[PDB]
Amino acid sequence: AKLETVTLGNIGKDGKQTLVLNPRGVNPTNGVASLSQAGAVPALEKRVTVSVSQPSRNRKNYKVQVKIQNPTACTANGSCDPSVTRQAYADVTFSFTQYSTDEERAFVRTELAALLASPLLIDAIDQLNPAY
Protein backbone atom coordinates (compact mmCIF):
# COMPACT_ATOMS: atom_id res chain seq x y z
CA ALA A 1 0.00 0.00 0.00
CA LYS A 2 1.08 3.64 0.06
CA LEU A 3 3.87 4.44 2.50
CA GLU A 4 2.60 6.57 5.37
CA THR A 5 3.69 7.32 8.90
CA VAL A 6 2.95 4.22 10.93
CA THR A 7 2.06 4.75 14.56
CA LEU A 8 2.51 1.65 16.65
CA GLY A 9 0.81 2.14 19.99
CA ASN A 10 0.51 0.38 23.34
CA ILE A 11 3.81 -1.39 22.86
CA GLY A 12 6.64 -2.24 25.22
CA LYS A 13 6.68 -4.58 28.21
CA ASP A 14 4.32 -2.26 30.08
CA GLY A 15 2.17 -2.04 26.97
CA LYS A 16 2.34 1.71 27.49
CA GLN A 17 4.62 2.79 24.66
CA THR A 18 4.20 4.35 21.23
CA LEU A 19 6.37 4.54 18.15
CA VAL A 20 6.00 6.68 15.07
CA LEU A 21 7.65 5.64 11.84
CA ASN A 22 8.01 8.15 9.06
CA PRO A 23 8.18 6.75 5.53
CA ARG A 24 11.66 6.95 4.07
CA GLY A 25 10.87 6.20 0.45
CA VAL A 26 11.28 3.00 -1.53
CA ASN A 27 14.64 1.89 -2.87
CA PRO A 28 14.02 0.71 -6.46
CA THR A 29 17.38 -1.03 -6.83
CA ASN A 30 15.96 -3.71 -4.54
CA GLY A 31 12.31 -2.77 -4.05
CA VAL A 32 12.69 -2.15 -0.33
CA ALA A 33 10.40 0.16 1.60
CA SER A 34 12.08 1.85 4.55
CA LEU A 35 10.53 3.30 7.68
CA SER A 36 12.47 5.26 10.23
CA GLN A 37 12.01 7.05 13.53
CA ALA A 38 12.26 10.86 13.75
CA GLY A 39 15.83 10.97 15.12
CA ALA A 40 17.79 12.90 12.45
CA VAL A 41 21.07 11.06 13.18
CA PRO A 42 21.11 7.90 11.00
CA ALA A 43 23.13 5.86 13.47
CA LEU A 44 20.42 6.01 16.13
CA GLU A 45 17.25 5.60 14.11
CA LYS A 46 14.92 2.70 14.87
CA ARG A 47 14.17 1.13 11.50
CA VAL A 48 11.71 -1.17 9.79
CA THR A 49 11.73 -2.42 6.21
CA VAL A 50 9.40 -4.45 4.06
CA SER A 51 9.67 -5.93 0.59
CA VAL A 52 7.71 -8.35 -1.54
CA SER A 53 9.54 -10.37 -4.13
CA GLN A 54 7.58 -11.84 -7.00
CA PRO A 55 8.51 -15.27 -8.38
CA SER A 56 11.28 -15.24 -10.99
CA ARG A 57 12.93 -18.27 -12.68
CA ASN A 58 15.21 -19.26 -9.78
CA ARG A 59 12.51 -18.57 -7.19
CA LYS A 60 8.95 -19.80 -7.76
CA ASN A 61 7.38 -18.12 -4.75
CA TYR A 62 6.47 -14.78 -3.32
CA LYS A 63 8.63 -13.64 -0.43
CA VAL A 64 7.44 -10.96 1.95
CA GLN A 65 10.28 -9.85 4.16
CA VAL A 66 10.11 -7.55 7.14
CA LYS A 67 13.11 -6.49 9.15
CA ILE A 68 13.36 -4.32 12.21
CA GLN A 69 16.53 -2.94 13.78
CA ASN A 70 16.66 -1.00 17.03
CA PRO A 71 20.00 0.43 18.22
CA THR A 72 20.62 1.57 21.79
CA ALA A 73 23.11 4.36 22.35
CA CYS A 74 25.35 5.13 25.30
CA THR A 75 24.75 8.84 25.75
CA ALA A 76 28.07 9.58 27.45
CA ASN A 77 30.79 6.93 27.75
CA GLY A 78 33.33 9.56 28.82
CA SER A 79 32.98 11.52 25.57
CA CYS A 80 31.10 14.39 23.91
CA ASP A 81 28.73 12.48 21.61
CA PRO A 82 26.67 9.26 22.02
CA SER A 83 27.47 6.09 20.10
CA VAL A 84 25.61 2.86 19.42
CA THR A 85 26.35 0.14 21.95
CA ARG A 86 23.96 -2.65 21.06
CA GLN A 87 21.67 -3.46 18.18
CA ALA A 88 18.49 -5.51 18.33
CA TYR A 89 17.21 -7.29 15.25
CA ALA A 90 14.16 -9.24 14.23
CA ASP A 91 13.96 -10.80 10.80
CA VAL A 92 10.75 -12.11 9.28
CA THR A 93 10.07 -13.79 5.95
CA PHE A 94 6.94 -15.30 4.49
CA SER A 95 6.88 -17.69 1.57
CA PHE A 96 3.77 -18.14 -0.55
CA THR A 97 2.97 -20.03 -3.75
CA GLN A 98 1.40 -18.74 -6.95
CA TYR A 99 -1.80 -20.32 -5.67
CA SER A 100 -1.67 -19.04 -2.11
CA THR A 101 -5.18 -18.00 -1.25
CA ASP A 102 -6.25 -14.63 0.03
CA GLU A 103 -7.07 -16.15 3.41
CA GLU A 104 -4.21 -18.64 3.59
CA ARG A 105 -1.74 -15.78 3.85
CA ALA A 106 -3.84 -13.68 6.24
CA PHE A 107 -4.04 -16.66 8.56
CA VAL A 108 -0.29 -17.04 8.85
CA ARG A 109 0.09 -13.35 9.51
CA THR A 110 -2.53 -13.22 12.23
CA GLU A 111 -1.22 -16.50 13.65
CA LEU A 112 2.31 -15.22 14.01
CA ALA A 113 0.86 -12.15 15.65
CA ALA A 114 -1.21 -14.08 18.18
CA LEU A 115 1.78 -16.31 18.77
CA LEU A 116 3.89 -13.33 19.75
CA ALA A 117 1.43 -12.73 22.56
CA SER A 118 1.50 -16.30 23.85
CA PRO A 119 3.18 -16.62 27.27
CA LEU A 120 5.29 -19.37 25.75
CA LEU A 121 6.79 -16.91 23.32
CA ILE A 122 6.97 -13.95 25.68
CA ASP A 123 9.14 -15.92 28.07
CA ALA A 124 11.29 -17.20 25.24
CA ILE A 125 12.03 -13.74 23.86
CA ASP A 126 11.63 -11.41 26.81
CA GLN A 127 13.58 -13.61 29.14
CA LEU A 128 15.55 -15.83 26.77
CA ASN A 129 13.91 -18.82 28.40
CA PRO A 130 13.82 -21.88 26.13
CA ALA A 131 10.58 -23.85 26.07
CA TYR A 132 10.70 -26.63 28.62
Instruction: Work out whether 57 is an interface residue with a copy of itself (CB under 8 A).
Output: no
Residue 18 Cβ, how far from a copy of itself at the closest point, in Å?
9
Per CB under 8 A, contacts with a copy of itself among 61-100 are 62, 64, 66, 68, 70, 72-83, 85-100
Q: Is 113 left (phi over 0), alpha (psi -120 to 50) or beta?
A: alpha
Residue 80 Cβ, how far from a copy of itself at the closest point, in Å?
3
Per CB under 8 A, contacts with a copy of itself among 7-36 are 8-13, 15, 17, 19, 22-31, 33-34
How far is 111 from 132, CA to CA, in rounded Å? 22
Instruction: Choose among 69, 35, 37, 40: nearest CA to 51.
Output: 35
Instruction: Work out whether 59 is an interface residue with a copy of itself (CB under 8 A).
Output: no
State CA 1 to chain mean position distance: 17
